[PDB]
Symmetry: D2
Subunit: 314 residues, 4 copies
């Protein structure tokens, strides 16, 4: 029972044509529908559900909500009960609130982000099929992202005022949603303050992550690539499409995953993440990164925490 | 609750010095202990428990038993109860039956293989540590296998006599151990016979697998590599060590994982498996491979099922 | 002055539609013209001359001739003079003998193969251009071969009758065409017999190569890929196109280049060759491979000389 | 006849212990001798001559001279004659001027750099040998650089005063040393000014290169790696050794080679260069990069010419 994986992310964009162009041509996603309000829904080739990205017209960037898929419909009642015993109030949006989407349990994380849980979303299949499938499909576009992998949320954090919603979110998704902590960044005196946490339901290093900030927001959504080579191809694609790069190809110290940071035309940050890294396990020790090695935890090859990683988000 | 991953495999070898030489120099494992009976225990660099491979002196090759680790000690009683309601009789070997190993629930699969479940094994840590760790350790040897990944068991199968322990094992580990089926090979009239199944507890394509055969036995144990490049390095290592190759570097149609098959000095087959392949999920459709494409399911690049894959095992 | 590189290879095929389909879809070549006799001319994306492959209608497989490009027109007279002082008779086919091709110096190697040298061939450019070019072009097809890299010729060899045209060809292209020997396979008593030689004009390990055989013929023509990863992609392409594989992805001991052997629909062997391997240099020692390690020289990962490598050619 | 490749580079360092530590541990070179004046000589594993790097004690960074190897001793007289007809005065340092080094023709490039040509240097062999060699050697250290690949020299350039030693060096090495131009960066009105040129004697994209600057100096020396994957490993090595990175892993638009820029402990810039890129050929069109795309020519993935690439050198 419980949460399976990240289901979709709903983003604000200011130019729909340019944004759809970006997620199709750069990341290789496909548009699957547009609702009557102008929202556009896209999926990756190696996902089987209708969509993992919602683009909504807006006058600003940022995130509307984040959705995770659960195994069965009955999980929603059980998780709703645990969430409310913890002190978080929930609502249940019914079927068709979002097109091709079943009912959704809705609530706010302690950091203030809206999170939804759904059990049912329209099946459409991967672009390779499930009867004698090819390992990859022809006509793949751009970086050819496999699937939406995880989301890093900036969480309001003010330790000298007793506010650390990174810690509160971490406690919340572990106790209520039964995520387990895989890696953490410890700052403050003797590493007494959790400033960044990575948590999983799958056996990958992270399906959700939180990083401290002056306010709450969206750091990035991430898409999976197979290998370091695909990261090279993806970087070649971003050059051909005049994409604005945040961080050039390098490796994360945390998770060991090779990565590129870049921006969509509205300013939301995207990541192409390469490799499993390691098999996340509930009996595995939590990987701890300390403040003196804070740079290598994010950008391992340089040990230099970019000013853009910690200052720029939507 | 429940099974986490494959825990260890206990193999028969006829030359201990040569076998230990093989798993250390070719796969990069490290010997962690030798018990009073001459059994040798080895682990991979990216595992944190004491051992994943047991080598036992013998006059033949083959497998003694297969062990999977569960999340907590109380899972053993719960799983024991389910297993026995299904019709399989169990025993509980207590702590220290194997050195550095907690109590073990022991039973036979329908195919006749001995399977054990344990919750407790001595922690020793990975060779990179868990405080500001490097992505890989210096002094890595041979192919530098990350961890024991899965095991493919040959299962007695005689359809015209009503015997298919591949199907019986598949039903057993799903109903009792709550594995889920990720991929299957269908043969016989219209694909009405399961001849090969791949099943998971992690979100990787397989942690156990069964393939039909005239008798039951061990097809191979497999070790994880990161990338296709590491497969090249591993093949270079096998050449330097005069390893007997079964199948040269290629890709599996099933799981999409890139692979090499080769033999230890006693004849047991090993595999170096590269890549995640895809994120296995309980809501993902089961990938079905048919008999006409049976060759591409195992050796995707040639479409040629090696006579050694289906005739040679221990 | 002198020879620059391999220029084109003219092959016999029995099904033109199927053969053109193969070189376009599998190797990623493009048809550039068809002459009035039905011959088809193809080039690779990273070549700038009109064509590197000629397909000619026939009732059998094999090679018509092999062509190398020289730096300037005046080289043809100088090389003609050296060739004839050596004892080989030459002719000069004038402009337009082949479409879009300048005059050609024609002669037979000691092994009997027809070889041509040309200075002039119509320029058409690479598919990426030469003003701010991309590293690779969009719409790349199949394996996306960069260029025709080299050709291995089977050369009549009967040592107990005093016939070794591998040695005679090797002496010929070194003394007359100023190739230099990079690697050799030595067989017979104490390695006293040259059975395979690799020779270069570029600073790559080989632009031409000779291997002994009961008769003279074509072993394969080869196309360059960048990386080991591209070899994986190429093998994936061959599976999608139901290509007949000779040797699955592995590494050559000679040259260190990673490779795949496979067949066109008429039976001619092709190779996708990955990597520089090393910088070939006139002051570099000749790499010598001995008969006991003859298997590793060709298929390094297995040490097993395929019966098809030494029995099957056209 | 003529120049074969870059032979060695002699660098100034301020801390010999730290510098030798860097070239051994980070790049994987080996110290082969130290002369009576404290100069240290190192080679790469895939070079066969005694050394390719000289470290000389100094109170500053920078380059002493640059040396290229020629095919035969008689080339030195012929090249000396051409060089002096051009207007450059030469001297001939005799055998043993440098240890294990034959006589050297010495002269200044128009940009003022000292250049030497030698025909003879002590042979010691590669670390894999030349009889049935492995593709790579065991005990490889750090990034495992194959060989010193090329050198980029900053050349005094003041167009509004009629000074462009990039153009003068380019004309010099082409007319006198018979290099050929492979790629150029064109700036100024309509691209009328050569600001960067890449020139070859091998069939690789460059063995020497010049870039304009306010003064003349050393931009970097470069070492060859096989693949994009080795660039990842090299970046992992630099992190483990706390190396100061200039540019994180990315691809060059020019040459198509994947690259990392970083510094030795004295401030000299090094590069780990991956891949052939393309086969450089005397009949290949010169790749032209324009000023509007000047950023992509150096750092292709971002299109952002680092301020450090054009401001920092020794
Ligand atoms: O995906 C990530 C893995 C490790 C560290 C990060 F900041 C990431 O975004
Ligand atoms: O690990 C494997 C994945 C797919 C097919 C197989 F036969 C395997 O051993
Ligand atoms: O391209 C080749 C390199 C080494 C050995 C061979 F047989 C080849 O075809
Ligand atoms: O090695 C190089 C290739 C292309 C451009 C550069 F700046 C280089 O250093
Ligand atoms: Ca994940
Ligand atoms: Ca697994
Ligand atoms: Ca070549
Ligand atoms: Ca070069
Ligand atoms: Fe991320
Ligand atoms: Fe396997
Ligand atoms: Fe070849
Ligand atoms: Fe460079």
């Amino acid at each position: 029972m419980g949460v399976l994986r990240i289901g979709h992310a709903s983003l604000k964009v200011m130019d729909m044509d340019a944004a759809v162009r970006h997620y199709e041509n750069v990341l290789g996603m496909k548009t699957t529908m547009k609702d009557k309000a102008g929202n556009v829904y896209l999926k990756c080739w190696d996902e089987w559900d209708k969509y993992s990205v919602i683009l909504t017209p807006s006058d600003q960037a940022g995130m509307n909500h984040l959705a995770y898929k659960v195994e069965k419909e009955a999980d929603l009642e059980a998780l709703q009960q645990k969430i409310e015993a913890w002190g978080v109030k929930t609502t249940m949006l019914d079927e068709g609130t979002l097109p091709s989407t079943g009912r959704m349990l809705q609530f706010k994380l302690p950091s203030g982000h809206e999170m939804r849980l759904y059990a049912s979303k329209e099946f459409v299949g991967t672009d390779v099929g499930n009867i004698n499938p090819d390992p990859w499909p022809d006509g793949l576009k751009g970086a050819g992202a496999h699937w939406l992998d995880h989301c890093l949320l900036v969480c309001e954090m003010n330790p000298e005022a007793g506010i650390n919603t990174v810690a509160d979110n971490t406690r919340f998704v572990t106790e209520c949603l039964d995520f387990f902590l895989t890696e953490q960044v410890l700052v403050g005196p003797g590493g007494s303050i959790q400033a960044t946490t990575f948590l999983a339901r799958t056996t990958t290093p992270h399906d959700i992550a939180f990083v401290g900030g002056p306010t709450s927001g969206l750091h990035h959504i991430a898409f999976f690539l197979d290998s370091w080579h695909d990261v090279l191809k993806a970087a070649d694609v971003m050059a051909k499409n005049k994409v604005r790069i945040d961080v050039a190809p390098t490796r994360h110290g945390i998770t060991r995953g090779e990565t590129i940071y870049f921006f969509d035309p509205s300013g939301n940050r995207n990541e192409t993440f390469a490799g499993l890294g390691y098999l996340a396990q509930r009996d595995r020790p939590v990987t701890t990164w300390t403040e003196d090695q804070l740079g290598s935890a994010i950008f391992y090859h340089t040990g230099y925490l970019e000013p853009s990683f910690t200052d720029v988000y939507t």
